[PDB]
Design a protein around this ligand. Structure first.
Ligand code: CL
Ligand code: CL
Ligand code: CL
Ligand code: CL
Length: 136
């Protein structure tokens, strides 16, 4: 499983996402408990703009490792890309539970409320993002 997974990563690093997907799937066929293989398979589909597959595979990663702030944040991003702003808020909130000092998560939480027309909530979360990164 380790050699298929790292072959997938060597493709992913070059932006060869079709091949990354092929080889991550071979890794998972052999070891389906690898949170990291599911998460990176999700990432390869995300990079291709296939958000339905990204969401499916991030959800599997997070079943195996619910302490992955990165998987929560990227699941929020995949739902944001689909215009599902309440699910973006749901998963950004989980990422911030695990890393309250993530300027990126505060900012994207702000952008989900902005897309809903809740501009005062957006202001609140952009203010938190700027408390952490005043040069953004
Ligand atoms: Cl992970
Ligand atoms: Cl889940
Ligand atoms: Cl929604
Ligand atoms: Cl919160």
């Amino acid at each position: 499983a380790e050699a298929w997974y790292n072959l997938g990563n060597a493709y992913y690093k070059q932006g060869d996402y079709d091949e990354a997907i092929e080889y991550y799937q071979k890794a998972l066929e052999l070891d389906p408990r690898s949170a990291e293989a599911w998460y990176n398979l999700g990432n390869a589909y995300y990079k291709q703009g296939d958000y339905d597959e990204a969401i499916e595979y991030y959800q599997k990663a997070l079943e195996l490792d619910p302490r992955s702030a990165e998987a929560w944040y990227n699941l929020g991003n995949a739902y944001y890309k689909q215009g599902d702003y309440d699910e973006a808020i749901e998963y950004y909130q989980k990422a911030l539970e695990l890393d309250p000092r993530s300027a990126e998560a505060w900012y994207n939480l702000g952008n989900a409320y902005y897309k809903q027309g809740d501009y005062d909530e957006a202001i609140e979360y952009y203010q938190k993002a700027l408390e952490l990164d005043p040069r953004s």
